Amino acid sequence: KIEEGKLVIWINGDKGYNGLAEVGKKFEKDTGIKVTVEHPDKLEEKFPQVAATGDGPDIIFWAHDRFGGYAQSGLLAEITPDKAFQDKLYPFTWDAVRYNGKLIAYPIAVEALSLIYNKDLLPNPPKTWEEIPALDKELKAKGKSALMFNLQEPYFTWPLIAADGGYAFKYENGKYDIKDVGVDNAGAKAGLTFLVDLIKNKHMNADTDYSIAEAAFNKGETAMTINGPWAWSNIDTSKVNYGVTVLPTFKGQPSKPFVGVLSAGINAASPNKELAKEFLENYLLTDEGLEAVNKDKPLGAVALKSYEEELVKDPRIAATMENAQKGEIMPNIPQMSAFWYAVRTAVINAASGRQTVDEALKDAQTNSSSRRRIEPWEFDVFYDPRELRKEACLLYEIKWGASSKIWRSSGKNTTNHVAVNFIKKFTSERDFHPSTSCSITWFLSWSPCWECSQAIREFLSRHPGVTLVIYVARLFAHMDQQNRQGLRDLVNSGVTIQIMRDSEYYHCWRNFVNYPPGDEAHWPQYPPAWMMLYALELHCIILSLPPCLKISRRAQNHLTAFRLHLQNCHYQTIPPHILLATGLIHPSVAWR
Amino acid sequence: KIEEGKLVIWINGDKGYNGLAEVGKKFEKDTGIKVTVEHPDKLEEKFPQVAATGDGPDIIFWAHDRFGGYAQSGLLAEITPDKAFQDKLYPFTWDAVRYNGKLIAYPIAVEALSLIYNKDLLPNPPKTWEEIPALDKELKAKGKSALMFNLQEPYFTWPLIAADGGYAFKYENGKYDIKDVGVDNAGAKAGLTFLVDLIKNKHMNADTDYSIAEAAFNKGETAMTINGPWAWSNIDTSKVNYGVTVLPTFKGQPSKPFVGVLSAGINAASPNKELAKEFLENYLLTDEGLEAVNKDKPLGAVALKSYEEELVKDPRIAATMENAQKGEIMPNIPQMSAFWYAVRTAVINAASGRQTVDEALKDAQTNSSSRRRIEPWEFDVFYDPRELRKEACLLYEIKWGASSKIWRSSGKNTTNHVAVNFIKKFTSERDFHPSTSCSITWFLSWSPCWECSQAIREFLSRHPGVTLVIYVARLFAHMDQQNRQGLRDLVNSGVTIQIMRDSEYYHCWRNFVNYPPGDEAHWPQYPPAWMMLYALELHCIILSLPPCLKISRRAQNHLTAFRLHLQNCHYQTIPPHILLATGLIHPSVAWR
Ligand SMILES: OC[C@H]1O[C@H](O[C@H]2[C@H](O)[C@@H](O)[C@@H](O)O[C@@H]2CO)[C@H](O)[C@@H](O)[C@@H]1O
Ligand SMILES: OC[C@H]1O[C@H](O[C@H]2[C@H](O)[C@@H](O)[C@@H](O)O[C@@H]2CO)[C@H](O)[C@@H](O)[C@@H]1O
Ligand SMILES: OC[C@H]1O[C@H](O[C@H]2[C@H](O)[C@@H](O)[C@@H](O)O[C@@H]2CO)[C@H](O)[C@@H](O)[C@@H]1O
Ligand SMILES: C[As](C)(=O)[O-]
Ligand SMILES: C[As](C)(=O)[O-]
Ligand SMILES: [Zn+2]
Ligand SMILES: [Zn+2]
């Protein structure tokens, strides 16, 4: 767990955890800090749950796709690599680890799927997918199956989908569109139908996973497979004459597999961020340590120019990099998460006889762009009476008096305050519903800033028929004259502002959180201390009164000082029920 | 709540409420302030219940015995009469209305019980109690009663108890001893035994109350009665030729009834202190006002020298004054309440035969200095939001392992920290209770101070076999090196100290508080903020840590400043469950 003077690292079990542990033991021999490497099941999903509470790993190794979402939730800490060390790595890798113009993780290596074929059972690999069935038949009469790969994860099935036009959040103008998804394109459907046909035609088993595929190829039972560099080690120990080459073409077009950038991020809650930076910049990302890691399980094209200079000489590395070039780099935006959850489901339903290709891809098309859901860990990270610097919070519920139906969704911090983002979405999409007489209800943790107050006021004056109500859980810089006037302005302009309470939190839990089936309505009872304190301060703001409480923090959640100063002014003008509700003052005497 | 610009007065229905109302009407005609007089049932007990909430009357008329307790609860306000006016009343009256060197009420008049006899049915009243049965027999042959008086209230039966040495509290120069009680004295036993004999011997009925007694005397059914001046009016309208004289002598000794000083106290919460002072000093305590009150229901000898000087000429007033002289001044200490509540029961149990005279007097003797059933209003005056320095909970429950019986009761401040009071009481009564095993459980308000800690440790060392557990609700001067080291000292000496929580308060409510009959097991749900805060500070104390929170008060319960300073030391050593329970910090920091 995150201990002082200790490093806890999490890396996928398929990679070189022992090699990384050896590098860590060298770090321990030099500085005296135990480096413990762990590989839990589906760490990409366990990491936020434990990092939010605080008991997690000091460093996390994984692709760059989920690092975006992590940094969005404020789980990763910014890395400061001087220009000398920054110039040591290729610019593509750094561009892959940059979120909102800020570096969030150290690039370790590049990984792309490649076609590994048994040179003994097949001297010349096939150049196209259409000839795979015939080949399979010819080898089935001999007692062996060909081209067996993991069908459980969409990362392996995506090359066929993208071969003829599979766009995942089309990119243009330097920005990735979330609404425009391509998993339902003609080419995507064609590729998935071909794979489903390969399964139906008895050429491939839908139950095949990474373990079964790798074991069958290592035992000479299969002539081909699709995998990255990590498998090369076990394949070498299998003494099977194999060859790594490019992936076959689908309908005369090159298969486009996503390019993953294995990177290491530093936990924002770990107090050993200095030790983490030292370990990753001085011992891991060097020819010595990176070579030791590569020794256990190969990691493909590395990010270090010093090592890559003589590592690209391996034809296997060259084939993987060629496949990556033919492919496209994986985006690191947060929505990617949902994207995969959708494709992974579609692929499964396409492998089984539950849904057709069109049905699965259409459901994935409509679910890849989802913002109607929110996880419980991130709910505790944003909607909580306790402070977290990364505001990034908005639960909006729009109701139209005409149809009397609630349309709910969320919003996060995208290089701009969420208020400005919702305003832009409302102004851009004119087809709301009848487009008039709408009641908007916001559930955000931090109070709108002065600039956001002016923007929301201009937006509300722009559209007359908008009944807007705001529920805030925390107060952003409640001791800034401008923020004060902004909140008073919003209230005076017809915007109700109230501090979230038990009712509001439970309502948000039921309507927005992706709570598990069993724990239905089991919302996390938050302490009323800060709820009542922020309510008292907010009422002092509305009454143009001086600040009563003063907070003094120093880190993401470190509270050093807290003071409550109630002047004669407060006792004389602030209503008594609020003071009595905070529980810190006496009732009968507050009234006298 | 208490109204502005209005005077509300509460006086017992047996006094001249109409006369007081007319004086208030004159005050209204002169200053334009409606003075409304009310007479609620059992106001001596209703007044504190409403005064704790703050609502109630502006002025209260009653004996000074209950004013001491009222003042200790912070319910009465200090009066500031000038010397010119103070010299208008008798000095000993002010002495009776003085509590802790401060005048808490305006003395109105003095009242003492007198023997009222029907001059037609009895020409010569009896001079001794021993001849009362004889007289009775004669009148029984006539179809009349000899002596019928209210025996439900101990105020009427006390003269016989004190006739041969019955004292409520011990009398010393400036020192009124609470522990030394004389309700178990030989003379007290003899007096109550004579009363019980009068009841058992068919000379008096044990169910006789004030109503039946007064009505029977006014209807010529009985030849004698015992009453004060207030009954004189109704007796005058009864057309019965009566006479007021001194009380008979028991065993050749004069009957000693407590003398009540009817006084008017000003509610400490009422915002009309000035109006109350004016009404009491300029219109009520004058010859005109006192005469207008005397016309309705006589008040006996008033405290005003101008009126009393020419009022003593009435033989009835002279007889009342003689009974008062031969009697004794009623103490105004708070414990008086319990005292009476004790005697009241004893007497009843002796009249109904449910308990013998010795049993009733012994129980009254043991429960006259304390009270085993605390009222809810005074229990509300004891809690953590109230910073009031005066009241000290001192709820103690002692079990004797030899019998597995629990002894429950309370105690108060009385010019000495409750610690030394309990030490002295236990050291004095050690011989009367069981032999060796003992486990004391304290539920007190303020954490023992430096001096109290040293006294407690020396008491615990003086008695080897004593297991003491302390549950405190607040922390007194938690920023004093001496108090700090004292608490640590008590802990190191084998004494457990913990901050009271919901469970402890519920236990105190169910076992010590006089729970309401209709509302059973409903303990007052109080906010936990200060409970958790004082708990965090207590842990900082025990762990020899620097002060964490700092309070800054300005009035009775006016909290002007409250600061929480959690240094790195605190975060590093304080247990995380306490910090997390306060609700002001994040679990991430607590976990680390
Ligand atoms: O949750 C499944 C996961 O699939 C992909 O993860 C890849 C990973 O990027 C590679 O480094 C390698 O380890 O194979 C994994 C599939 O087993 C996606 O990268 C990821 O977004 C997704 O969550
Ligand atoms: O959520 C992002 C987070 O970044 C920073 O968090 C780190 C930071 O690296 C440190 O300088 C220090 O301030 O606290 C954290 C690690 O101890 C910031 O705290 C803040 O911008 C933000 O919350
Ligand atoms: O403690 C019991 C109760 O007894 C006496 O009360 C008398 C009072 O003195 C009389 O003036 C009359 O008006 O009311 C009571 C008789 O029922 C004590 O004087 C009183 O203080 C005390 O509370
Ligand atoms: C989401 As904000 C920092 O504008 O309140
Ligand atoms: C601190 As104390 C008045 O209970 O001795
Ligand atoms: Zn903003
Ligand atoms: Zn003390």
Numbering used by the authors:
A (entry chain B), B (entry chain A): 2 to 371, 1015 to 1236
Article excerpt on this structure:
Finally, the mXT construct was given the catalytically dead mutation E63A to generate an inactive APO1 construct mXTi for crystallization studies. Crystals of MBP–APO1 mXTi were obtained, and its structure was determined to the resolution of 3.5 Å in a space group of P21212 with eight molecules per ASU. The structure of an individual subunit reveals that the N-terminal APO1 deaminase domain (residues 15–187) has the typical core fold of an APOBEC deaminase domain, and its C-terminal domain extension has a novel fold that is unique to APO1. The A1HD is composed of a β-hairpin (β6 and β7) and three small helices (h7, h8, h9). Within an APO1 molecule, the A1HD uses its β-hairpin and h7 and h8 to form hydrophobic interactions with its own CDD, positioning its β-hairpin across the top side of the Zn active center and in close proximity to loops 1 and 7 of the CDD. The other contact interface is much larger, with a buried surface area of 1526.5 Å2 that consists of mostly hydrophobic interactions mediated by the C-terminal A1HD. The A1HD mediates dimerization of APO1 primarily through the pairing of the two β-hairpins via β7 of the two monomers, forming a four-stranded β-sheet connecting the two subunits. The interior face of this β-sheet interacts extensively with helices h6 and h8 of A1HD through hydrophobic residues to create a hydrophobic core between the two APO1 subunits. The dimeric structure of APO1 reveals a large positively charged surface spanning across the two paired β-hairpins of A1HDs and branching out to the two active centers near the N-termini. The crystallized APO1 mutant had deaminase activity on DNA but not on the APOB-derived RNA that is known to be specifically deaminated by WT APO1.
